[PDB]
Structure formats: C-alpha cells, structure tokens
Design a protein around this ligand. Structure first.
Ligand SMILES: *[C@@H]1O[C@H](CO)[C@@H](O[C@@H]2O[C@H](CO)[C@@H](O[C@@H]3O[C@H](CO[C@H]4O[C@H](CO)[C@@H](O)[C@H](O[C@H]5O[C@H](CO)[C@@H](O)[C@H](O)[C@@H]5O)[C@@H]4O)[C@@H](O)[C@H](O[C@H]4O[C@H](CO)[C@@H](O)[C@H](O)[C@@H]4O[C@H]4O[C@H](CO)[C@@H](O)[C@H](O)[C@@H]4O[C@H]4O[C@H](CO)[C@@H](O)[C@H](O)[C@@H]4O)[C@@H]3O)[C@H](O)[C@H]2NC(C)=O)[C@H](O)[C@H]1NC(C)=O
Ligand SMILES: *[C@@H]1O[C@H](CO)[C@@H](O[C@@H]2O[C@H](CO)[C@@H](O[C@@H]3O[C@H](CO[C@H]4O[C@H](CO)[C@@H](O)[C@H](O)[C@@H]4O)[C@@H](O)[C@H](O[C@H]4O[C@H](CO)[C@@H](O)[C@H](O)[C@@H]4O[C@H]4O[C@H](CO)[C@@H](O)[C@H](O)[C@@H]4O)[C@@H]3O)[C@H](O)[C@H]2NC(C)=O)[C@H](O)[C@H]1NC(C)=O
Ligand SMILES: *[C@@H]1O[C@H](CO)[C@@H](O[C@@H]2O[C@H](CO)[C@@H](O[C@@H]3O[C@H](CO[C@H]4O[C@H](CO)[C@@H](O)[C@H](O)[C@@H]4O)[C@@H](O)[C@H](O[C@H]4O[C@H](CO)[C@@H](O)[C@H](O)[C@@H]4O)[C@@H]3O)[C@H](O)[C@H]2NC(C)=O)[C@H](O)[C@H]1NC(C)=O
Ligand SMILES: *[C@@H]1O[C@H](CO)[C@@H](O[C@@H]2O[C@H](CO)[C@@H](O)[C@H](O)[C@H]2NC(C)=O)[C@H](O)[C@H]1NC(C)=O
Ligand SMILES: *[C@@H]1O[C@H](CO)[C@@H](O)[C@H](O)[C@H]1NC(C)=O
Ligand SMILES: *[C@@H]1O[C@H](CO)[C@@H](O)[C@H](O)[C@H]1NC(C)=O
Lengths: 102, 51, 51
C-alpha cells in the first residue's frame, strides 16, 4: 500500500509527485515511538495526578492515574467488565495504580 | 509425571510459559492448545558438554 | 465513450465488441454525466499512482 506525495502551487493546481510504499505484517516485534528516546535502557513513562493519554499493556484511553497500595495478589491488569482499566500493578514491584476518568 | 501424562493438580508452574506465535495473554480464562501432557520429566538432568 | 469501428470503412469490426467494464471506482463511468459532484477530477489513458 502507499502514501501519494502531492504538490501544489498555493492549492490551485494539484499534481502527484511520487509515493511512499510500505509493507507490513501484524504482530508485536516492532513498536513506533513518538520521539528519539535516548540514554534510557528500558523505555516507559508514567505521569500522575492529572489527565493523560495512556497506553498501558495495550489498554488505550485517557484519565488520571494515582498511586496506591493494596494486597492485590494475582496478575497485573485490572479491568471493568466493559474492558476499561481500573488499575494496574507495576510488574517489577507491588505498587499499584488506580485509573479514573477525569 | 502422573498417569496419562498429567501435571499434578496444585503444582506451581514456576518457569513454565505458554507458547505463542504472536500476542500473549496476561490475565483471564481460555481454552488453549499447549504442550502440557508429559511422556517424561527428567530432574536436574546432568546435561554436560559430553552428553 | 466512442468505439470507431467506422475507421475501417467496412465494419468487419462489427464482430468485435469493445467497452468499459465496471471499474475499481466508487462510480460508474456512464453515470458521470448525471449530476455528480467533485472538487477535482482529471482523467488519464496511462497509469497514474493512486488512480
Ligand atoms: C484464577 O486466577 C485468579 C487471577 O489471579 C484467581 O483469583 C485470585 O486468587 C487469589 C488467591 O490465591 C486472590 O487472593 C487475594 O489475597 C489477598 C492477599 O492476602 C492473602 O494472601 C497473602 C498471600 O497469599 C497472605 O499474606 C495473606 O494472609 C494473611 O493475612 C490475612 C489478613 O491479614 C490472615 O487472615 C492470614 O492469616 C495471613 O496472616 C492472605 O491470605 C486478599 O486481600 C484478597 O482480597 C479479597 O478478599 C477481601 C476479603 O473477602 C475483599 O475484601 C477483597 O475486597 C477481595 O475480594 C475481591 O476479589 C474477589 C476476587 O476477585 C471478589 O469475589 C470480591 O467480589 C472482591 O472483588 C471486588 O474487588 C476487586 C478489587 O479489589 C474488583 O476487581 C472486583 O470487581 C470487585 O469489585 C484475595 O484473597 C486474588 O486477588 C485473586 N486475584 C484476583 C486478581 O482476582 C482465581 O482464583 C483463579 N481461578 C481459580 C479457579 O482458582
Ligand atoms: C505456530 O504456528 C505453527 C503454524 O503451522 C504451529 O505449528 C503446527 O502445530 C501443529 C501443532 O503444534 C503441527 O501439526 C501436526 O500436529 C499433530 C498433532 O496431534 C494431534 O492430531 C493427531 C491428528 O489429528 C492425533 O492423532 C493426536 O492425538 C492429536 O490430537 C502431529 O501429530 C503432526 O505431526 C506429523 O509430522 C511428524 C513430522 O512430519 C510425524 O511424525 C507425525 O507422524 C505427523 O504425521 C502426520 O501429519 C503429516 C502432515 O504433513 C501427514 O503427512 C502424515 O500422514 C500424518 O498424518 C503435526 O506436526 C503442525 O505441524 C505445526 N506447524 C509446523 C510448522 O510444523 C505452532 O504450534 C504454532 N505455535 C504456537 C505456540 O501456537
Ligand atoms: C515500575 O517500578 C520501577 C520500580 O523500581 C520503576 O523503575 C524505576 O524508575 C526510576 C524512576 O521511576 C529509576 O531510577 C532512577 O530514575 C532517575 C529518574 O529521573 C527522575 O528522578 C530523579 C531522582 O533522583 C530526579 O532528579 C529527576 O528529575 C527525575 O525526576 C534516573 O536518572 C536514575 O539514573 C541514575 O541511577 C542509575 C541506577 O543507579 C544509573 O545507571 C544512572 O547513571 C544514574 O546515575 C535512575 O535510573 C529506576 O532505575 C527504575 N527502576 C528500575 C528497575 O530500573 C518503573 O519506572 C515503574 N514503572 C513505571 C511505568 O513507572
Ligand atoms: C473485404 O473487401 C472490402 C472489398 O471487397 C474491403 O474494404 C475495402 O478495402 C480497400 C483496400 O483494402 C479500400 O480501398 C476500400 O475503400 C474498402 N472498402 C471501403 C468501403 O472502405 C474489406 O476490408 C475486406 N474486408 C476484410 C478483409 O475485412
Ligand atoms: C497538571 O499537568 C501539568 C502538565 O499537564 C503539570 O504541570 C501539573 O503539576 C499537574 N498536576 C496537577 C495536579 O495540577
Ligand atoms: C496505601 O493505602 C492506604 C490504605 O489505608 C492509603 O491511605 C495510602 O495513601 C496508600 N497509598 C500509597 C501510595 O501509599
């Protein structure tokens, strides 16, 4: 599939210049990143206490994340029966985070 | 190894992963097709470069 | 759309039928004369990327 490259002179005339071609297959080996992160050995980001957009273990949405601590024995993802994050446990440790819709 | 190759109920699967070809499950219940019936099981096997 | 069988002067070409097929486009060629509306169009007899 492709992305046509178009040219115009002040949006009067329009013509195609060329195109960018891309192939792909679905899966989870390669991830796009918003900017050229450097220095960091393992990439993640977490903002607390006011609205964010998040991508957390493939759950995507918006809201406010706050830290807490409860004896949540079990896995690392907690969701509603509508598929929305209620919270998550930060894998390497026992800290848990609560996710709310601002 | 139990009769018919079952893993004993109550075992903790300390380092046993589910195999995948793509995505992974994190939390939930489902029917899987996985290499979990044993014909053998060899403890602390003694594998060396001479094996 | 015009098929010039008449170019032969003696239409043995009447045994041939040459016409446009339904295209890969969200419109029928023959219906482009109804009151269809565009911002821009352009037509070509040669391959154009994205067309
Ligand atoms: C399939 O896998 C599942 C996924 O992991 C599994 O479910 C999980 O099962 C474990 C059992 O191993 C859950 O156990 C939790 O343990 C808490 C931890 O404390 C215990 O364990 C420590 C480690 O084992 C011990 O150190 C500690 O014991 C010590 O302290 C005691 C207290 O001081 C003392 O008496 C002992 O001597 C000792 O000194 C202890 O034993 C425990 O807190 C936890 O909380 C539940 O119970 C509280 C009491 O009922 C409720 O107050 C809490 O409020 C919990 O109930 C919630 O979860 C139930 C399970 O999900 C629901 O029925 C309830 O409705 C309630 O759910 C609400 O809240 C959830 C938010 O908290 C929300 O998501 C729900 O929608 C709902 O709103 C609990 O025992 C573990 O958490 C289960 N984990 C998960 C994620 O569910 C399931 O068993 C497996 N399937 C099969 C077939 O087995
Ligand atoms: C990632 O994606 C790959 C994608 O292909 C997938 O690998 C494929 O796995 C299946 C399972 O791992 C392999 O296919 C066959 O599986 C049977 C499984 O046993 C069941 O079925 C038989 C028949 O229904 C029952 O009797 C049995 O009880 C079970 O219920 C194997 O037995 C097949 O093995 C054959 O080949 C061996 C080597 O060639 C022979 O020794 C064996 O005799 C088999 O012969 C049979 O099949 C031949 C097929 O060409 C046929 O010619 C023979 O007559 C005879 O019938 C077999 O392997 C499938 O091969 C796998 N893929 C690849 C690349 O090989 C991965 O599992 C998936 N991974 C994950 C984690 O999802
Ligand atoms: C899940 O839980 C783990 C639990 O450990 C969290 O991972 C750790 O994150 C901290 C951040 O959370 C990493 O530790 C250190 O972070 C610094 C981050 O910068 C902020 O904090 C400093 C704190 O002094 C402020 O000055 C600064 O403004 C920022 O606000 C790094 O700069 C540190 O680097 C230094 O130490 C390392 C280790 O000794 C040296 O290699 C570096 O040269 C340097 O001197 C440092 O890394 C901590 O390392 C992380 N944990 C692990 C295991 O690595 C995860 O963040 C959390 N998950 C999520 C999503 O947050
Ligand atoms: C069949 O014959 C006619 C003549 O019998 C052919 O048409 C003529 O071809 C000549 C030269 O080849 C031209 O000068 C004439 O002017 C043609 N006729 C007309 C009306 O223009 C015809 O092409 C032959 N047709 C075939 C073989 O398909
Ligand atoms: C709100 O977000 C801005 C960034 O969007 C940050 O400066 C500020 O501390 C935030 N927190 C709160 C609770 O106001
Ligand atoms: C931990 O839980 C207590 C439970 O009573 C709460 O007051 C405290 O803020 C929690 N949060 C954190 C991050 O410690």
């Amino acid at each position: 599939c492709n992305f046509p490259l178009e040219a115009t002179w002040h949006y009067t005339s329009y013509t195609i210049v060329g195109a960018l071609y891309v192939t792909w297959s679905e899966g989870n080996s390669i991830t796009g990143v918003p900017y050229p992160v450097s220095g960091i050995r393992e990439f993640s980001n977490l903002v607390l206490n006011n609205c964010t957009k998040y991508n957390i273990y493939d759950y995507v949405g918006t809201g406010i994340i706050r830290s807490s601590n409860q004896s949540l024995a079990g896995g690392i993802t907690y969701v509603s029966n509508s598929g929305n994050l209620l919270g998550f446990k930060n894998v390497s440790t026992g800290n848990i985070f609560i996710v709310t819709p601002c | 190894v139990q009769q018919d190759g079952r893993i004993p109920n109550g075992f903790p699967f300390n380092n046993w992963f589910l195999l995948t070809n793509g995505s992974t499950l994190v939390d939930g219940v489902s029917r899987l097709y996985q290499p979990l019936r044993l014909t053998c099981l060899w403890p602390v096997p003694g594998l060396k470069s001479s094996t | 759309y015009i098929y010039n069988r008449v170019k032969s002067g003696s239409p043995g070409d009447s045994s041939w039928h040459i016409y446009l097929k339904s295209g890969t486009c969200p419109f029928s060629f023959s219906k482009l004369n109804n009151f269809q509306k565009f911002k821009t169009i352009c037509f070509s007899t040669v391959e154009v990327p994205g067309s």
